[PDB]
């Protein structure tokens, strides 16, 4: 009997830290887009 090698099955990992970090940074950066008007 030779059942093969079930080690051919592999789960991958993900890396989205760049995107998470950038979303948090843009959320903070939007504060610089708020409008502060001059008085007439």
């Amino acid at each position: 009997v030779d059942l093969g090698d079930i080690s051919g099955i592999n789960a991958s990992v993900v890396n989205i830290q760049k995107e998470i970090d950038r979303l948090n940074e843009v959320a903070k950066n939007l504060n610089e887009s708020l409008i502060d008007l001059q008085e007439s």
């Binding site: 009997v1 789960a11 991958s12 979303l23 708020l34």
Partner: protein, 227 residues
């Protein structure tokens, strides 16, 4: 007093409020993405740890089955062979039973992540449509206000405020587009890994059933010979 300034205050205050709601949505999306990243990677590590142990176990089962086959081919007493076969069959049965429980738990954890990811894709796509509409309305209103200042030039406060409103709107739209690209990139990478790992788990379930069927076929032939 100055009706054009009143118009500017109205647009500025409405815009600032709208930016706050978008900020909150982005922070929420980032938190949910971080949770999904952690869960996907934990589930992947759990599957790879299980596959490594299973491969070791199947090698040993095959070796024991082949040792018994070789002893039948050589011709020994049936009593000792039957006892060794019964012990092997009980060992395989315990390995099978515990494995079924592990596979159920893994399938549930993987589906939980897949369901949460699909939900976040839906949520963020809905937010994208909403924000696009909000931004378009603001752009329309801002461009319309130009027509009331034709006779004004640099230095005039109203003209300066209109330039500021436009500049701040344009900077916000640029940041929102950056956030949208980052959200889409993250969701797509999560989707790819979740799909690959779902296929891996399904392949594992199928290959285990096939392997246990082959083991049973060989064991049943062995037992039929012991007479």
């Amino acid at each position: 007093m100055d009706v054009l300034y009143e118009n500017q205050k109205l647009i500025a205050n409405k815009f600032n409020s709208a930016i706050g709601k978008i900020q909150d949505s982005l922070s929420s999306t980032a938190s949910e993405l971080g949770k999904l990243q952690d869960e996907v990677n934990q589930n992947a590590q759990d599957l790879n740890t299980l596959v490594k142990q299973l491969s070791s176990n199947f090698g040993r089962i095959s070796s024991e089955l082949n040792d018994i086959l070789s002893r039948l081919d050589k011709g020994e007493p049936a009593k000792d062979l039957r006892s060794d076969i019964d012990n092997l069959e009980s060992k395989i049965a315990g390995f099978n039973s515990s494995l079924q429980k592990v596979l159920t738990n893994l399938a549930q954890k993987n589906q939980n992540v897949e369901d949460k990811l699909k939900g976040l894709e839906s949520r963020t796509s809905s937010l994208e449509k909403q924000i696009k509409g909000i931004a378009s309305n603001f752009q329309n209103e801002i461009l319309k206000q130009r027509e009331y200042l034709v006779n004004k030039g640099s230095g005039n406060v109203l003209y300066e405020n209109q330039k500021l409103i436009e500049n701040q709107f344009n900077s916000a739209i640029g940041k929102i587009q950056d956030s949208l690209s980052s959200t889409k990139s993250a969701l797509g990478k999560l989707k790819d890994v979740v799909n690959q790992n779902k296929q891996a788990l399904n392949t594992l379930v199928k290959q285990l059933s096939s392997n246990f069927g082959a083991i049973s076929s060989v064991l049943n032939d062995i037992k039929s010979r012991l007479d």
